[PDB]
Amino acid sequence: PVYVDFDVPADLEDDALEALEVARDTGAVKKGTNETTKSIERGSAELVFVAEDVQPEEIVMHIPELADEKGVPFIFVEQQDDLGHAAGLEVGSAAAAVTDAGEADADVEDIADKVEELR
RNA sequence: GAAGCCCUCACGGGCAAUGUGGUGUCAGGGCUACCUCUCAUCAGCCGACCGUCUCGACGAAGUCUCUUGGAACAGAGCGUG
Ligand SMILES: [Sr+2]
């Protein structure tokens, strides 16, 4: 909420999670705020997800600005456990990063595009 | 970066991407590229001597004479470990 600066429509979040699921099956994805953080720093990240029900918020507060000064596009998910399920985890995930999609590159592109428009 | 931990005989359950586990800890470390090599460390297995304290077993040689005395464990004489 303090790091969130725009609401994402359930529909968009839907497409993003699906795109993320086919990303792990095909391409490569990072699970965890730390791994997600290094990817954004090493530049090996295409799309990073960030849960919105993260408490404490400090764990993810840095993702937004870090992503901006790195061109890396990012999107919010209303729930932490979905992101983890989608990321293929048996647990939750405060943040996620698609380290190069996989037969989803097309979708990822649009989502990023759609997001930028959503400001 | 799930390669992990806990409970249960098992089935199964719980924990864990807000990081279990690997690596590492100033002879700094890590990574990339090399040489060599380990007996350092950490973990676990086995597992005492001796010594000290206490307890216990075993363990030599007179119960001879006279006198005094209620009593010899005394005096005098002979004898022993
Ligand atoms: Sr959780």
Curated annotation (Swiss-Prot):
One of its GO terms (cellular component) is cytoplasm. One of its GO terms (molecular function) is rRNA binding. Its main location: cytoplasm. It holds the Pfam family Ribosomal_L7Ae. Gene3D superfamilies: 3.30.1330.30. GO terms for biological process: ribosome biogenesis; translation; tRNA 5'-leader removal. It is found in: Cytoplasm. Keywords: Cytoplasm, Ribonucleoprotein, Ribosomal protein, RNA-binding, rRNA-binding, tRNA processing. Multifunctional RNA-binding protein that recognizes the K-turn motif in ribosomal RNA, the RNA component of RNase P, box H/ACA, box C/D and box C'/D' sRNAs. PANTHER family: RIBOSOMAL PROTEIN L7AE FAMILY MEMBER. Part of the 50S ribosomal subunit. Interacts with protein L15e. Probably part of the RNase P complex. Belongs to the eukaryotic ribosomal protein eL8 family. This is Large ribosomal subunit protein eL8. It comes from Haloarcula marismortui (strain ATCC 43049 / DSM 3752 / JCM 8966 / VKM B-1809) (Halobacterium marismortui). The gene is rpl7ae.
